[PDB]
Amino acid sequence: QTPYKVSISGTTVILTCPQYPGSEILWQHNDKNIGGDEDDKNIGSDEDHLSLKEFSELEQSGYYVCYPRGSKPEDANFYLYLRARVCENCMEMDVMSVATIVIVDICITGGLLLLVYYWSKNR
Amino acid sequence: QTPYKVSISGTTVILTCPQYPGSEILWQHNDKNIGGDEDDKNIGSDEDHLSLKEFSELEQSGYYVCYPRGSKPEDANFYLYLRARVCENCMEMDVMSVATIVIVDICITGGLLLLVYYWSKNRK
Amino acid sequence: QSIKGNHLVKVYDYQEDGSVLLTCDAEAKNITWFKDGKMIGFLTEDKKKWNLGSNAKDPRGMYQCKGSQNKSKPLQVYYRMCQNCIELNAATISGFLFAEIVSIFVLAVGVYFIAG
Amino acid sequence: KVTQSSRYLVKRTGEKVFLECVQDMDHENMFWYRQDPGLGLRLIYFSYDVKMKEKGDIPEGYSVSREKKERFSLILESASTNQTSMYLCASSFTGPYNSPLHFGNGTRLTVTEDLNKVFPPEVAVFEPSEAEISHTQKATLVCLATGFFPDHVELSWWVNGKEVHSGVSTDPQPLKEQPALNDSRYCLSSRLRVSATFWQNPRNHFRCQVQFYGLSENDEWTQDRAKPVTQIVSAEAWGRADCGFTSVSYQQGVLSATILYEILLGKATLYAVLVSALVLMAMVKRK
Amino acid sequence: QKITQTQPGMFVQEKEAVTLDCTYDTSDPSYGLFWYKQPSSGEMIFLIYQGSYDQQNATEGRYSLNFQKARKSANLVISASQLGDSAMYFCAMRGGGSGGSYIPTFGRGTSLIVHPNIQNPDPAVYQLRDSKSSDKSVCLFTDFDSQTNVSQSKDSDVYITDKTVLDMRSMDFKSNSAVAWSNKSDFACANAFNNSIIPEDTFFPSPESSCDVKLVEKSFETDTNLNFQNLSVIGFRILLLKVAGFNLLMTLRLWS
Amino acid sequence: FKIPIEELEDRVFVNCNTSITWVEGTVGTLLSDITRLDLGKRILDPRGIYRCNGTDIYKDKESTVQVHYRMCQSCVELDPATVAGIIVTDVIATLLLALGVFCFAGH
Amino acid sequence: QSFGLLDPKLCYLLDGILFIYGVILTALFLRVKFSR
Amino acid sequence: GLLDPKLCYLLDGILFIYGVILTALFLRVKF
Ligand SMILES: *[C@@H]1O[C@H](CO)[C@@H](O[C@@H]2O[C@H](CO)[C@@H](O[C@@H]3O[C@H](CO)[C@@H](O)[C@H](O)[C@@H]3O)[C@H](O)[C@H]2NC(C)=O)[C@H](O)[C@H]1NC(C)=O
Ligand SMILES: CC(C)CCC[C@@H](C)[C@H]1CC[C@H]2[C@@H]3CC=C4C[C@@H](OC(=O)CCC(=O)O)CC[C@]4(C)[C@H]3CC[C@]12C
Ligand SMILES: *[C@@H]1O[C@H](CO)[C@@H](O[C@@H]2O[C@H](CO)[C@@H](O)[C@H](O)[C@H]2NC(C)=O)[C@H](O)[C@H]1NC(C)=O
Ligand SMILES: *[C@@H]1O[C@H](CO)[C@@H](O[C@@H]2O[C@H](CO)[C@@H](O)[C@H](O)[C@H]2NC(C)=O)[C@H](O)[C@H]1NC(C)=O
Ligand SMILES: *[C@@H]1O[C@H](CO)[C@@H](O[C@@H]2O[C@H](CO)[C@@H](O)[C@H](O)[C@H]2NC(C)=O)[C@H](O)[C@H]1NC(C)=O
Ligand SMILES: *[C@@H]1O[C@H](CO)[C@@H](O[C@@H]2O[C@H](CO)[C@@H](O)[C@H](O)[C@H]2NC(C)=O)[C@H](O)[C@H]1NC(C)=O
Ligand SMILES: *[C@@H]1O[C@H](CO)[C@@H](O[C@@H]2O[C@H](CO)[C@@H](O)[C@H](O)[C@H]2NC(C)=O)[C@H](O)[C@H]1NC(C)=O
Ligand SMILES: *[C@@H]1O[C@H](CO)[C@@H](O)[C@H](O)[C@H]1NC(C)=O
Ligand SMILES: *[C@@H]1O[C@H](CO)[C@@H](O)[C@H](O)[C@H]1NC(C)=O
Ligand SMILES: *[C@@H]1O[C@H](CO)[C@@H](O)[C@H](O)[C@H]1NC(C)=O
Ligand SMILES: *[C@@H]1O[C@H](CO)[C@@H](O)[C@H](O)[C@H]1NC(C)=O
Ligand SMILES: *[C@@H]1O[C@H](CO)[C@@H](O)[C@H](O)[C@H]1NC(C)=O
């Protein structure tokens, strides 16, 4: 099984429809057609991905389904349950990143100090 | 118009109603009249004020409305939604307080350092 | 808080994420929002609530909403949560005094030695 | 779909009371029934079709109007304490072959001889005992609504601003404070059971809400106390961890550390300025 | 033309089949039988119908109707009973509405109570913490077996509710509960349920408190502000370290 | 035909009418009810792909559901001005330390 | 039981770095003092 | 366990002064 691709950046969420590479697709959220209306600036459907801007956790969380055009949207048998807490300017980072940035900062400071001391000792 | 004034000093919260000058005021919380001649010392009302003593966040947070006597609550032109936490001793660390504390610590530290420096120079 | 009286703005609080939301009583599909008079945005049939952000930032001000007929009466929101208030108990003052005396002693030794 | 005018009503003796019943299934036969404890359903009135008024088992003191096909209204010309009960409305087709009745939601009607007796409830919430949490790793909050009349209340639980249906048990019917004697007020209780970890998170908010149906705005009130109108009475609680390390303690510790390190940084930079000034002065004065 | 139900009030365990009886008599040869269910809310819900001139008893989900014209008995049978079946069941029959006897008649009604399978009895009598806004003292009799039935309090100032079933879907746990409360100084409810026949080995907690700090730290969670403050503290420590290093080097430069 | 995902007090559960087959991701915990699977707390970001059958009218057709959670227990807000300040302050501090080293080097 | 960027490994990482520096420096000092 | 940062702060407070004192003493003894 090839899963959905979900990308979150700031308050923008992009979902990718995996199992239909060579046909037009439609997206449906909680039994209601979404995207592809050429309006509603915050929602877009280009190529084979759905882009949701200014994502709201309270209202835009739930079921999502992708189905080919011309097929009744209940034959589909692969849904995505999405619940995301988005935030403006909020970026995610784990403890390993903080540990490594602190370590490299200490190392570069020590190296610079040693280099300056060796340069200034002789003269 | 002119908004309510909210003053917090410890566990006492005072609400001030600028509108209706010279007209005696009635106060409502959550559609219940308060501030009247009721047997309670925690809640008090005078000419234009409302003092809530030992403020409890769970019980006393919500909608407050100010209206002159003989009028109707919905005829008032303002509603205040107040939700607050209080302490007996919780002094707040904002930018100005931190700056003041840092500045005074620097000035006493510098004074003591200069005094001890002069003492050391004179002794040695 | 009566519709008869042009009181339409309500606060929708106590959420799992801490945000503060505003709700307009008007039945119009698109609702425009004003803060202290100046417009701050508009919403359509998909979104029913306006987000004021986390309550730890103490959202304060005056808000109105207008869908079709007229501007509702202002609602004044005031928050005071003490995300920065400090309890002045024994431990805090003891630690403060300990740090102060240790730092003063260290600096005093340092400035003593370099004297003269 | 059959609907009625309201679900709860309170009136005084000697007044005129109107009850409405509206259907939309094109039904010919209409029935107005009364339910009593220990008596069963009793047929008040029946209407075969439009402009038909025929007597029932207990027809005294009631009237109806069937001036329209889709309407069947009932009238208590002079309400009295004798007529306090639950009233139901039903609709059915013509012919007893395959025409069962279709009831609505019903209306509970209480008639008192003085409006002074109407009181709002008092709602309190009691937190779980630590003994239960230690013994079975579960918490049970109890909500009590006492001292109200008439028994026309509804109770609900809201956690984090959302209504909760799982893990809630409420009394089927309000009981009486003193059943021995008359004019007695009512009590109601409810239980919410939660896992222990969920309860002692200080970020969780629990609330018990009681909606009370009382007097309307079109009633004379000449009493010193407040007017007992339809309202909502609530009780709130925060998650409580009396023993242990919670987020509040960590937040306080971090704030204190921040202030202390800012002060120390200020002292250190003051000393740095002083020593730099001394070095520069020595270098200048040497030459 | 009359309908009678023999037994008022029935009890059944969960995941069982229960039969409620209805005996009728009539003179007309054409009629029909049907049933309604009325839960605690008050509404009447139509359940099942069966005519007089048709075989092949009707069946909807968990409901069925056992019909015996010769014995004149229409019985409602519910299979795989759940906890939602606790209601009042009414049996009714039509009549010849041509001459004078339309008169849809109704039965008296039978109560039904569904008892869960506890599967792990553990009776206990806890006392709940005070409200700080009320003078009542409330305590809870919980986790007892289905058979243990609670009696009312003889004392006038003590209020006791009947047993109630609670269901937790988060950990699929069923339980029975009762509450007793009063306003009096000497109300210590090791003896509040005196009139009731409580079972043996019922837990009575000690007045002292107990704790498990591991359980308390199991329910810990953070937010973005705490992360930002922690990072700020780390940065302040690093900056202080660097400034102190510079201070020390300059001091050894200017030692004396 | 969507596999119901329910959100009780603070956990998340998967509900089917038959046994739930795990395809990938979070293993989960069974409730002693075969037709229910517990994925744990929501703030721990349970993610996975599960599959199960159906009943009633859905006798002979599968269904697959992918659960994806994102709650920012590790997220942190970072305005560009703040990070610019952080790097410039750190560079100033390390330059000051290097200057101190250079001044100490002679003596 | 989620810590996020509150896991106690961070300040203890700083403390461990400072401890390692201190112990190696005091070992060097002690060796120099005994040698001279 | 031991998620209380009070111990962490006390430990680094001790280590800081110890480290600076030994740094000064060693840097003098070498030179
Ligand atoms: C798992 O099994 C349950 C039953 O054990 C299924 O719930 C049932 O789903 C059917 C849908 O085929 C519901 O029937 C519907 O009834 C309404 C009202 O009469 C009607 O208008 C619809 O057209 C449809 O016939 C049925 O009510 C429902 N049962 C209950 C108690 O609500 C469920 O769908 C099964 N789930 C899966 C994933 O197979
Ligand atoms: C730079 C050198 C000279 C060190 C300065 C003195 C040290 C001994 C300081 C540095 C950090 C200080 C600590 C910083 C933070 C705290 C948190 C603070 O947390 C609380 O428990 C108070 C809040 C509450 O208890 O409600 C208690 C003091 C303490 C341990 C301080 C004690 C003294 C310490 C270890
Ligand atoms: C209902 O109770 C009231 C008072 O408890 C009574 O109403 C009487 O109704 C009859 C109608 O036959 C009148 O003649 C009397 O004048 C009414 N009494 C009063 C005091 O108004 C009576 O006991 C009950 N009525 C019915 C019809 O059952
Ligand atoms: C009248 O009773 C019906 C029950 O027959 C109620 O319909 C229920 O409504 C709730 C929503 O609150 C649904 O969850 C139930 O599934 C409904 N039951 C049925 C059988 O459809 C109806 O809400 C009642 N009317 C009022 C005004 O409360
Ligand atoms: C409804 O179901 C009942 C239950 O099976 C049927 O009654 C049975 O009738 C047969 C016919 O001879 C008897 O042998 C059984 O003993 C009866 N069972 C019971 C429990 O009484 C009934 O016949 C069915 N209804 C119709 C119209 O056929
Ligand atoms: C519950 O209360 C009644 C008191 O009369 C008892 O339950 C009886 O149990 C027997 C056993 O089969 C039945 O035959 C009776 O019909 C029951 N009576 C009633 C009124 O339900 C019993 O004493 C109590 N339960 C326990 C466990 O003691
Ligand atoms: C879901 O039901 C289908 C049948 O509807 C099961 O598929 C069968 O799986 C067995 C393996 O044990 C095969 O031998 C059959 O040929 C399959 N039949 C069909 C029609 O696919 C499937 O195993 C069921 N899944 C679960 C988890 O029980
Ligand atoms: C609602 O009003 C806004 C205000 O500019 C407008 O942009 C929007 O198109 C309106 N909605 C509809 C459905 O016309
Ligand atoms: C709406 O506002 C206009 C002026 O802004 C006013 O003329 C009108 O009367 C208002 N509507 C109502 C119903 O009063
Ligand atoms: C209450 O008073 C009325 C009127 O005197 C009387 O009919 C009724 O029986 C009294 N209540 C009880 C429980 O006796
Ligand atoms: C308990 O409270 C009730 C309710 O007001 C009151 O009637 C009763 O006198 C109180 N009892 C005591 C002992 O205070
Ligand atoms: C309480 O129950 C015990 C059971 O042994 C009994 O002896 C005692 O009399 C009861 N107390 C009262 C006040 O009835």
Author numbering:
A (entry chain E): 33 to 155
B (entry chain F): 33 to 156
C (entry chain G): 23 to 138
D (entry chain B): 3 to 289
E (entry chain A): 2 to 257
F (entry chain D): 22 to 128
G (entry chain Z): 22 to 57
H (entry chain Y): 25 to 55
The study reports:
Adapting previous approaches, we expressed a full-length PN45545 TCR-CD3εδγζ complex in HEK293 cells and purified it to homogeneity in detergent without chemical crosslinking. We determined a cryoEM structure of the PN45545 TCR-CD3 complex to 3.0 Å resolution. Side chain densities were well resolved for most residues in the extracellular (ECD) and transmembrane (TM) domains of each subunit in the complex. N-linked glycan densities were identified on TCRα (N58, N150, N184, N195), TCRβ (N84, N107, N184), CD3δ (N38, N74), and CD3γ (N52, N92). Interestingly, the cryoEM map suggests the possibility of S-palmitoylation at CD3δ residue C124, consistent with a palmitoylation profiling study that revealed CD3δ as a high-confidence target. The cytoplasmic tails of the CD3 subunits were not resolved in the cryoEM map, presumably due to flexibility. Taken together with previous cryoEM studies that focused on different α/β TCR pairs, our PN45545 TCR-CD3 complex structure supports the notion that the overall structure and assembly of TCR-CD3 is unaffected by differences in TCR variable region sequence. However, we suggest cautious interpretation of these structural differences because the CDRs are not well defined in the PN45545 TCR-CD3 map calculated in the absence of pMHC.
TCRs are expressed as heterodimers of α/β or γ/δ chains in complex with three CD3 dimers (CD3εδ, CD3εγ, CD3ζζ) that are responsible for initiating downstream signaling. Here, we report cryoEM structures of two distinct full-length α/β TCR-CD3 complexes bound to their pMHC ligand, the cancer-testis antigen HLA-A2/MAGEA4 (230–239). We also determined cryoEM structures of pMHCs containing MAGEA4 (230–239) peptide and the closely related MAGEA8 (232–241) peptide in the absence of TCR, which provided a structural explanation for the MAGEA4 preference displayed by the TCRs.
